[PDB]
Amino acid sequence: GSHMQVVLPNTALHLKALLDFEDKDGDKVVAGDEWLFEGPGTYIPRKEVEVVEIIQATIIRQNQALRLRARKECWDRDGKERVTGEEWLVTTVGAYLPAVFEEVLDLVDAVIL
């Protein structure tokens, strides 16, 4: 195992959230959630989730941003199993964060000056 690491060089890894979450509101997970993690340097393997895959940085620019939206309905970004309507935007400077259930919709050049 690599144990907790340090702020990666603008890279991210895919983690799988393993936990029994039963909610009567209409949304519940059963040991089967997974998502990408940018800058997981301080990420540690906790029973709650488990390291699934890893990704280095090498594709974005210094301002280009990538807005991605969920495709299924179980990929949690900050640990909150959201639905396909949930989406997140990546603002890395020279990297590449391929989500798992969230696909990209387009590109957005950020402002440098």
UniProtKB/Swiss-Prot annotation:
In the record for this protein, the MVP repeats are positioned at: 5-56, 57-109
PTM remark: Phosphorylated on Tyr residues after EGF stimulation.
Coiled-coil region(s): none
Q: Localized where?
A: Cytoplasm; Nucleus, Nuclear pore complex; Cytoplasm, Perinuclear region
From what superkingdom does this record's organism come? Eukaryota
Instruction: Provide the free-text tissue specificity comment from this protein's UniProt record.
Output: Present in most normal tissues. Higher expression observed in epithelial cells with secretory and excretory functions, as well as in cells chronically exposed to xenobiotics, such as bronchial cells and cells lining the intestine. Overexpressed in many multidrug-resistant cancer cells.
What is expression of this protein induced or repressed by?
Up-regulated by IFNG/IFN-gamma.
Q: How does it assemble?
A: The vault ribonucleoprotein particle is a huge (400 A x 670 A) cage structure of 12.9 MDa. It consists of a dimer of half-vaults, with each half-vault comprising 39 identical major vault protein (MVP) chains, PARP4 and one or more vault RNAs (vRNAs). Interacts with TEP1. Interacts with PTEN and activated MAPK1. The phosphorylated protein interacts with the SH2 domains of PTPN11 and SRC. Interacts with APEX1. May interact with ZNF540.
Q: What job does the chain carry out?
A: Required for normal vault structure. Vaults are multi-subunit structures that may act as scaffolds for proteins involved in signal transduction. Vaults may also play a role in nucleo-cytoplasmic transport. Down-regulates IFNG-mediated STAT1 signaling and subsequent activation of JAK. Down-regulates SRC activity and signaling through MAP kinases.
Reproduce the free-text note on domains from the UniProt record.
MVP 3 mediates interaction with PTEN. MVP 4 mediates interaction with PARP4.
Protein name as catalogued:
Major vault protein
Taxonomic source organism: Homo sapiens (Human)
